[PDB]
Design a protein around this ligand. Structure first.
Ligand SMILES: O=S(=O)([O-])O[C@@H]([C@H](O)C[S@+]1C[C@@H](O)[C@H](O)[C@H]1CO)[C@@H](O)CO
Ligand SMILES: *[C@@H]1O[C@H](CO)[C@@H](O)[C@H](O)[C@H]1NC(C)=O
Ligand SMILES: *[C@@H]1O[C@H](CO)[C@@H](O)[C@H](O)[C@H]1NC(C)=O
Length: 856
């Protein structure tokens, strides 16, 4: 079976002599089927018996090209929970680099009631994880060898299906991985997210596999921060091939795909609950140039009444692109503008780069450099004593070593000092791969096994130190070779630590470019420097879905496209979709035509449609916020693939041009130039048009959805109750408004929903239980508002003043009881054609239990 051959010459075009040299098999009978492949027996074997331990078992593995092979390998397996299996493969005799991650070591006894069983084979070594309930083989290394050299470690697994989702950071273009022969390199790199499928800004080894239509799913995570590649083949099978550290694997079983994400996030860390304001709309560009220009853009979008919470300021606010300064001429009056923003209920987020100008003297001192030098907190060259010099925006630079706890002290004080001048509200950390305009350093990199390893994965440009730091550079956590992929992660950890001081008791907002597994505990993510093309629009959906799997649910691209002038039609469709990315920001590159919504004209279709859909986003913010609460507390996704709700239906398995907000809201954008319709899949559920309330005819079928220039498809799922709040142009204001309920009835006239409500900004409202959690349930004739947690009463005296019911016969004699005690008659408006009832003249106070009853 050619589909099962594991490639033995991953480094060069295949030849018989090399193959012979490697003791592999040769069979040149493509495309991509390996000509040279590992023999069926020629790997590691178990030495002696396995050893029962308290956590699981250990085995000793012994071996009979890419550096020193490790002769004796220790397998350590731990039955951590009923649904999480952990195994490490280490050097029996030498300690090796391991990621200094949230994840703690396991000091436990083996969990009870396992959903999985593990089987080890001895001659040759293989590891298999099967699901106990149906003996479905989930992990199975037997397809390939274990390879364990100092700078080349490889393990493969067969997969039980081709329903495979995950890996990053890349532009995959499709959400489902085909399992056609494909190699995905992972090594944090500043590169364009384009159709080339290169390594991008972040490193995410997690994948999820939907096993079958029952929903049974599993996930695999590799805890490894060295450059690596993930090799996919049609067996189906996946191979991990890394150039350092150890093979430290976790396997997660769930009954559903969402349960798999929850298991993964339980291990690596669930996402931060964002500030409610950060759910609003964000506007930004590279190079307004002057404060006057920035204010002009701010004012025209406010004039247009655009829902608009946050303004970002990019490196043009700085004095010559230097951190923690502003330009006293072009940005003269920045403090008064920040007061203006605040007074208008808006927030300022500032960009902050890691790299710190080293240009400092008696004449013109640069404080951040002087103070950081005093603290000795920079990344050093291999000599371990001289700060590494590279180049970024301000010129020659040194780079903070965020892995050193003293650096976060330095960093905090810098933000403290700057915040005294410019009262920013959130922080955008960029260029933190880390990105270097020179290769390695201003003196390049020394030739050695770190900078020039035996094997290099197929990373962009084919050198590790390309546009980053020397691999032999030295930080508190180790050498750059091992911790390069942790730069952005440690930076976000440190920036969150700074936020503890700058915004006491607040969440604030942190947006990061580079990430590692677990970055979502600290920061939001955006998909980087995209381009104003229809390709980039389409590619954004899988990227958003993937980051939700990764526990970074607040994710979005640069709406309308960073690079290039945006066509009006593309920007209009992108704003329409953009009103529904979990992170919604319009951002633009240097020099390009303006693409802020109001720049298209005060009476333009793009402005009108933008305002219209942003008003729907803001209306649905209580529902979106409640989704982020579930993501934070339980590990649920926010932007969700259809297959997560509809896995029983194999027509959902590669849908990637549509997605859900949580379980209940279906989003169908137009993603094709010139189009006024879209080919869409309608899952097996009752659906209601959001704007009209009318039940679609469609069910479990492909349709051509008619969507003119001012429309994006939005459908509400029957069985669900959506809390709403009357929109306004800021969430400061919107949070004071009356609330509503949209009850989308299922075929049985029933629905369920919930609402999380806290102060929208205090850190640890969830850990300290200072919040409201209520549940809504509808049966025929009755709505029940039930209160499950009631330790926060909003002092704005909020109430539900409207209930809209979809797919209903006329409700008559509506009664509102506050524990069996009625209170006068609400007004009911009924549309008998559309089957929509709207209950108004009602005053259901937030946090109070009610029963609303009717007859037919
Ligand atoms: O095309 S480019 O502008 O020159 O792209 C460069 C940066 O990634 C852009 S940064 C991130 C983006 O969101 C901010 O607006 C930009 C200013 O801080 C790379 O070329 C540097 O290697
Ligand atoms: C970097 O160099 C300074 C001396 O210049 C030293 O104090 C510091 O600990 C070094 N950092 C690392 C990570 O080795
Ligand atoms: C919206 O907020 C503005 C304050 O900017 C306020 O004047 C107005 O009353 C608010 N109205 C709504 C729709 O809540």
């Amino acid at each position: 079976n050619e589909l099962e051959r594991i490639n033995c010459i991953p480094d060069q075009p295949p030849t018989k002599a090399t193959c012979d040299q490697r003791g592999c098999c040769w069979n040149p009978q493509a495309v991509s089927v390996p000509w040279c492949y590992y023999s069926k027996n020629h790997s590691y074997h178990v030495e002696g018996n396995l050893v029962n331990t308290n956590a699981g078992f250990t085995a000793r593995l012994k071996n009979l090209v890419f550096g020193s092979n490790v002769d004796n390998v220790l397998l350590t397996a731990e039955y951590q929970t009923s649904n999480r299996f952990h195994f490490k493969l280490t050097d029996q005799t030498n300690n090796r680099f391991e990621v200094p991650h949230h994840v703690q070591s396991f000091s436990g006894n083996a969990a009870a009631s396992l959903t999985y069983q593990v089987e080890i084979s001895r001659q040759p070594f293989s590891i298999k994880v099967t699901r106990r309930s149906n003996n479905r083989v989930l992990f199975d290394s037997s397809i390939g060898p274990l390879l364990f050299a100092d700078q080349f470690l490889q393990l493969s697994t067969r997969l039980p299906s081709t329903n495979v989702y995950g890996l990053g950071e890349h532009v995959h273009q499709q959400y489902r991985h085909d399992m056609n022969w494909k190699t995905w390199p992972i090594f944090n790199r500043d590169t364009t997210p384009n159709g080339n499928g290169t390594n991008l800004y972040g490193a995410q080894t997690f994948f999820l596999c939907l096993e079958d239509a029952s929903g049974l799913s599993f996930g695999v995570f590799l805890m490894n921060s060295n450059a690596m590649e993930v090799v996919l083949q049609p067996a189906p099978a996946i191979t991990y091939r890394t150039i350092g550290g150890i093979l430290d694997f976790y396997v997660f079983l769930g009954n559903t795909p969402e349960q798999v994400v929850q298991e993964y996030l339980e291990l690596i860390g669930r996402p931060a609950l964002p500030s409610y304001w950060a759910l609003g709309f964000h506007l930004s560009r590279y190079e307004y140039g002057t404060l006057d220009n920035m204010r002009e853009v701010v004012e025209r979008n406010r004039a247009a009444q655009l829902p608009y919470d946050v303004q970002h300021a990019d490196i043009d606010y700085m004095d010559e692109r230097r951190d923690f300064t502003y330009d006293s001429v072009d940005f003269k009056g920045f403090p008064e503008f920040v007061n203006e923003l605040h007074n208008n209920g808006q927030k300022l987020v500032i960009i902050v780069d890691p790299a710190i100008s080293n240009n400092s003297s008696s004449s013109k001192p640069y404080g951040p450099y002087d103070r950081g030098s005093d603290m000795k907190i920079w990344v050093n060259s291999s000599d371990g004593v001289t700060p590494l010099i590279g180049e970024v925006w301000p010129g020659q630079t040194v780079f903070p070593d965020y892995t050193n706890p003293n650096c976060a002290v330095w960093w905090t004080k810098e933000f403290e000092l700057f915040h005294n001048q410019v009262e920013f509200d959130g922080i955008w950390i960029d260029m933190n791969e880390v990105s270097n305009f020179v290769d390695g350093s201003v003196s390049g990199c020394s030739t050695n096994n770190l900078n020039n390893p035996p094997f290099t994965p197929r990373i962009l440009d084919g050198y590790l130190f390309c546009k980053t730091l020397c691999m032999d550079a030295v930080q508190h956590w180790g050498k750059q070779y091992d911790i390069h992929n942790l730069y952005g992660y440690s930076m976000a950890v440190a920036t969150a630590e700074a936020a503890k001081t700058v915004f006491p008791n607040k969440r604030s907002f942190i947006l990061t470019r580079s990430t590692f597994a677990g970055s979502g505990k600290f920061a939001a993510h955006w998909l980087g420097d995209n381009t104003a093309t229809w390709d980039d629009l389409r590619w954004s959906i899988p990227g958003v879905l993937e980051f939700n799997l990764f526990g970074i649910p607040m994710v979005g691209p640069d709406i309308c496209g960073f690079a290039l002038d945006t066509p009006e039609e593309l920007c209009r469709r992108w704003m329409q979709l953009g009103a529904f990315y979990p992170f919604s920001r319009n951002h633009n590159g240097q020099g390009y035509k303006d693409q802020d919504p109001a720049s298209f004209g005060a009476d333009s279709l793009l402005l009108n449609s933008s305002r219209h859909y942003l008003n729907i986003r803001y209306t649905l913010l209580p529902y979106l916020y409640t989704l982020f609460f579930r993501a934070h507390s339980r590990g649920d996704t926010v932007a969700r693939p259809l297959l997560h709700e509809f896995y029983e239906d194999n027509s959902t398995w590669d849908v990637h041009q549509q997605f859900l907000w949580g379980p209940g809201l279906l989003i169908t954008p137009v993603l094709d130039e010139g189009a006024e319709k879209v080919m869409a899949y309608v899952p097996d559920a009752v659906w209601y048009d959001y704007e009209t309330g009318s039940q679609v005819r469609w069910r479990k079928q492909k349709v051509e959805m008619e969507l003119p220039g001012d429309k994006i498809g939005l459908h509400l799922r029957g069985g669900y109750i959506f809390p709403t709040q009357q929109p306004n142009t800021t969430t400061l204001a919107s949070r004071k408004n009356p609330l509503g309920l949209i009850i989308a009835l299922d075929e049985n006239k029933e629905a369920k929903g919930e609402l999380f409500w806290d102060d929208g900004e205090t850190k640890d409202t969830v850990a300290n239980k200072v919040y409201l959690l209520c549940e809504f349930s509808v049966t025929q004739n009755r709505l029940e508002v039930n209160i499950s947690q009631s330790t926060y009463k909003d002092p704005n005296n909020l109430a539900f003043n409207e209930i809209k019911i979809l797919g209903t016969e006329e409700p008559s004699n509506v009664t509102v009881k506050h524990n069996g005690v009625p209170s006068t008659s609400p007004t009911v408006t009924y549309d008998s054609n559309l089957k929509v009832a709207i209950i108004t003249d009602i005053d259901l106070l937030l946090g109070e239990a009610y029963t609303v009853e009717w007859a037919h």
